[PDB]
Predict the structure of Pyrrolysine--tRNA ligase.
Amino acid sequence: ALTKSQTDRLEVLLNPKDEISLNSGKPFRELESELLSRRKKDLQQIYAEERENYLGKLEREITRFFVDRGFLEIKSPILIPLEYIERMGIDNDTELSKQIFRVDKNFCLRPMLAPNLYNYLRKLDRALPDPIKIFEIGPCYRKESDGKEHLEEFTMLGFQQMGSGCTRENLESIITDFLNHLGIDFKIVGDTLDVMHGDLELSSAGVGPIPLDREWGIDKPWIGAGFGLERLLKVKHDFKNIKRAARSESYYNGISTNL
Amino acid sequence: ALTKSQTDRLEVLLNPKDEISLNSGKPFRELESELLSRRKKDLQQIYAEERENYLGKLEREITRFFVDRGFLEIKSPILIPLEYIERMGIDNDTELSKQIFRVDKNFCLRPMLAPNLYNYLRKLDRALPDPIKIFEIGPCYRKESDGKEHLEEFTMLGFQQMGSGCTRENLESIITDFLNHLGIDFKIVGDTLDVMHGDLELSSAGVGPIPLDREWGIDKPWIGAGFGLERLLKVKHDFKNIKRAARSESYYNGISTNL
Ligand SMILES: Nc1ncnc2c1ncn2[C@@H]1O[C@H](COP(=O)(O)OP(=O)(O)NP(=O)(O)O)[C@@H](O)[C@H]1O
Ligand SMILES: Nc1ncnc2c1ncn2[C@@H]1O[C@H](COP(=O)(O)OP(=O)(O)NP(=O)(O)O)[C@@H](O)[C@H]1O
Ligand SMILES: N[C@H](Cc1cccc(C(F)(F)F)c1)C(=O)O
Ligand SMILES: N[C@H](Cc1cccc(C(F)(F)F)c1)C(=O)O
Ligand SMILES: [Mg+2]
Ligand SMILES: [Mg+2]
Ligand SMILES: [Mg+2]
Ligand SMILES: [Mg+2]
């Protein structure tokens, strides 16, 4: 009989498409040696052929989708003024107020893309024709309890359109084309809306105007959404724990690096 | 005569390829209105045609170069254990010890890619054939004095090869092909080596083994280098201040967003 500690070790080496059973009559050492051989082989094939990181490749694939749909690619600061958090309405009564990674006295690691996207919408409205379509992909940070669906360091896609054409129908059409392009099953549940894969939230989306817009100098309708890239990878590759998709020293494209 | 404050404002709106002179006999308001029209036009052309961010596009171009040369694309944590800094030999007698952005009690924003690349080399040596070639591109953080060549939030390319073929000649060949591919003039000065554009350091490169390797479980020869992406963009686009190439709310592809 395998110990719990031994089964934990084998599950680190198990990939979703393996057809091995750990309740066999086979000893630990031989199940471990079999899985180690498979995972080394998996890494050798990546190294010999594609050599691309899942998280990097997904960001590039999403970038192409949105650029091709007419959205401007934004790269904005990850380390942001702490004042942005309060100005987002994130006060002490919100869960999120307790999740902020503070840096020095007046800064923090951004937990979301919305402040920077608001600022870009306001500034670009002085220069670009209506409607204004922008998106950003990059690191975001939140303190979280341990859990199979949460990382403290993750990657968010955020997109926003401002001006004409900002209807819930158009928002759902973007989400639907996007996820059908990536090959990810979803349901939209609902002006706020969540994009669900079973019980897992892939995105929260919204339709403006909302009262918060005024604090950011925004006074036009808008639609937008935010997606976690590691949650998309978790669903696409059927990972049991989102740690397999993270920026990590422990996994490469979902393969354990502790071999 | 323009005030100093007015000339500062015009220089925000000036792009390197403009052929306007601010020592003309033209009033500020009309020089400002001319430049504002040009910069709005520049943003409209980006939005209508390419829509890609300089920093994102450069990262994708560098990724293709290194993947095509046989290097594995790594995406590792930006928020790293504080212990990694000391283990890199960064003690109190180094400038860098005073430049760390600490987060909570045991973490920091990485100021370099070397700790994570060392860890990946050690782990992948159990699985991949010799030689092991890896690279990473992503955010790095250092407290800096104000200066036209430094950002507190920047983007570093780091690459490393371990095992056979780790000669200074091979290292210089990688650097030379890389920068000739990007179209960036350089000189290599020198086992340590710096890649210079005039007085600007584009890269520091190195040849192992070195004594530090043992602390990271490394005992094979290696070559590698680290490049700042914003410095590469600064040189390529002839920006006067690296702020024009940064993750920013103030500039988009070097164009002022304050129009
Ligand atoms: N800690 C996290 N790790 C990974 N992805 C995350 C994390 N927090 C948020 N996301 C993703 O970012 C998207 C937009 O952020 P947000 O709607 O604020 O998440 P959320 O409401 O906190 N979801 P949840 O924490 O699971 O109830 C979410 O739909 C997730 O896909
Ligand atoms: N603050 C910064 N802003 C932008 N790029 C940077 C910064 N610090 C380092 N880099 C880049 O990262 C590369 C590798 O890091 P490193 O060799 O440690 O820089 P460095 O020695 O501090 N150069 P410098 O600070 O100008 O004397 C450098 O060659 C630069 O191109
Ligand atoms: N669901 C969002 C993610 C998000 C990204 C970009 C824009 C927006 C917008 F303001 F459009 F809703 C949201 C969050 O975490 O705030
Ligand atoms: N010049 C380096 C940048 C760097 C990146 C990746 C690897 C390495 C290596 F360990 F190869 F030298 C260095 C620094 O800042 O440490
Ligand atoms: Mg949450
Ligand atoms: Mg949500
Ligand atoms: Mg320095
Ligand atoms: Mg240096």
Summary: The pocket of ANP (ligand 2) is lined by residues B 142, 144, 149-151, 154, 156, 201-204, 226-228, 230-231 (CB under 6 Å). Chain A touches chain B through 49 residues (CB under 8 Å). The helical segments of chain A are 4-13, 28-48, 54-68, 83-87, 114-124, 168-182, 229-237.
